[PDB]
Symmetry: D3
């Protein structure tokens, strides 16, 4: 059962859209990461979220287990951004994204352990400036 | 070019995530924005499409008669369900259910008036098993022209 | 190398859209089947094409090999009709379709054997009359 | 309701499959139809999207300036590539190539003028390995509102 | 680094395809593996998932309480179904059915004791028309951290 | 009806996972099966496909000339890749790579001599980040009539 006050998905988004909310979240038991990425190569958008998440202390740089949790969460977020085909550049479109990574327990029971949320917000469009609209994605996984 | 003050997607989400109590709906409307808000919980994805659709028709978000409007919204709803289902646009057949809250926002988000009106379909809620506690959050935003 | 005069895909479509072209095609070495299907259940659209194909002599009712060839071809056609999600009814949409099945060799070499083409044309829309547009699909497989 | 005389999809295909030599383009145009025709062969799917797009811009099928037009056509091209790729919208990364012919038709296909204008993207050609003979036919039709 | 002697994927599959007075489930358990075997035949995916989840909770492979382990086993099954369905995670609605045998394995397949527990869902059986003899083999394996 | 002794899927997989002075390829060939084994590691799907196709044509599993058998082996590989990629048939473009071992088997797995020849492509290895130790097992099997 989700704890009304710690819905990690909702929080990672509210954090992503508003222009230190991080301090507040960190004051509560949240591990938080933030970054920007503009690319037409999905692997760059993925490598950046991983690099940022490991740089800050959101997930362990050592081992595979947390990288697995984060990778799959990003994949679930990239789904909301690409809507059907997980392709950017190859389908003549590129993204300018802002992302947010949260790690912690969103449930009432302490036995649920930590979970990780990957959130993406920005524009998706043609390889030109004024040719795009908003794109959103949120990935949630157990870690 | 886009607007810092009129990003239909961002806005539509803000309204979706906020519980109370103030009227963020009044603000958007007063500002040339057609807005809809409803909540749907189903094991059938078609019920979620119908729900949003109908509400978008009662509240003059889109036109009740015709198809051109109902079409731009169908794909918006669809593109919103991708973020929600992430891969397989299936719920009950995949032993999963959704408890959702939705927001349909219609209006032009561009600096240039020539871009015409657009519509966004944002979704939020939970996705998990048929049983109550087992689940986590699920998000989805769809932006179509109209 | 395809034989300019016997492009099975092109022929199954030209046959599907025009209001006996079948006789002519049959006069050449083509096995042809025709039918109509209106449904919100994909399995019905699939079972009809199979039933029609076996009734007429397009494929063998006996055995699995030809049913396999036809099933996969229909699946490839259903892709063009559903565009992304192979769902009709469950995604609040239904179809009224006309289909065409062709069997024969479309290549210059006789060693290419027979191939089978599944073609679909009609409307895809809401569970209401004047709320739809055209949908098309063509599946091609070796048999 | 639809028209027996103005089904943008059916028509767009007829023009695509016919080789000569008469001018079926003259007929459609004379009858309030924006029409485009080109051929593209690529191992890169983006080149097929660009090709159709650009031609639709040179020939005033859609508007060169703005986005609202370029958007309705992108999804049409996309929905057309589903019929072509059938599952994975990939070509070269899946060791396959396409030799295509495309037709972009813009105009209203409904009995009621209120439905506004629509655009269809039909594709036809071959899909097979990089080598010449190895391949079979491939078809795809995309219909978006605009 | 995957400990060459404890490759959870490979083992679960070998168990799955083994015709054997010789219990392999015994060895696997003597060694720290929690093992579960089953069989479910159906034209409904949600029944296969359900069948695997219930067998897993009854035997001790995963916890009956809490979401965490259920979430882990769910996505793992999902990934195994991908191999079985190859494209469209649908059975009856695409006029096809499956007769599966299934293994679920839990343990640490790595050298480092920090990797913790992982889980593998493995499927093997047939897939084909509702009619008895028209079908061919199908296989699927999903691995996930738990 | 799948002849219990010649289940092409199961065999190809067992061969794939077998550590063995004991050649199984021998028995399979003594019995009418055309067998091919290989290994390809890469972050490019088109290389895996290519690798399988070349090995298959060099050894005699499929004809080097004509499209028919190539078309058969192509879709079969495609279906096997689905299990390996589970959702997105992409490797490097999704920051991941695979180290596969592969078997290709050709023969009639049915009782009736009319079913003719069928073909199975089976894959097993790892999938994970470009960096050495971060990965887990992956499996895939595609069956098709040839
Ligand atoms: N609007 C498109 C992206 C795009 C590319 N070019 C123009 N638009 C989408 O939904 O992804
Ligand atoms: N975790 C699943 C939903 C679910 C099904 N059962 C339990 N949870 C998802 O991401 O959609
Ligand atoms: N036009 C939709 C179908 C639909 C259902 N309801 C309205 N439209 C499509 O592309 O499939
Ligand atoms: N047959 C493949 C294309 C192909 C690749 N290589 C040979 N043919 C398809 O249906 O797309
Ligand atoms: N051969 C089909 C199953 C099937 C349906 N009808 C006949 N066979 C598959 O690969 O899923
Ligand atoms: N675990 C991923 C592969 C991966 C990419 N990065 C790390 N691991 C998969 O299931 O494909
Ligand atoms: Mn993984
Ligand atoms: Mn549509
Ligand atoms: Mn099959
Ligand atoms: Mn778009
Ligand atoms: Mn989940
Ligand atoms: Mn093919």
């Amino acid at each position: 059962t989700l704890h009304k006050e710690r819905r990690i998905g909702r929080l990672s988004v509210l954090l992503l859209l508003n222009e230190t909310q991080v301090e507040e979240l960190e004051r509560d038991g949240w591990k938080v990461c933030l970054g920007k990425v503009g690319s037409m190569d999905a692997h760059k958008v993925i490598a950046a979220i991983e690099t940022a998440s490991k740089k800050s202390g959101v997930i362990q740089s050592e081992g595979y287990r947390e990288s697995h949790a984060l990778y799959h969460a990003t994949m679930e977020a990239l789904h909301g951004v690409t809507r059907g085909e997980m392709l950017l550049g190859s389908l003549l479109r590129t993204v300018g994204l802002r992302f947010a990574v949260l790690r912690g327990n969103p449930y009432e029971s302490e036995a649920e352990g930590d979970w990780i949320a990957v959130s993406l917000y920005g524009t998706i469009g043609a390889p030109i400036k004024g040719l795009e609209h908003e794109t959103f994605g949120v990935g949630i996984n157990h870690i």
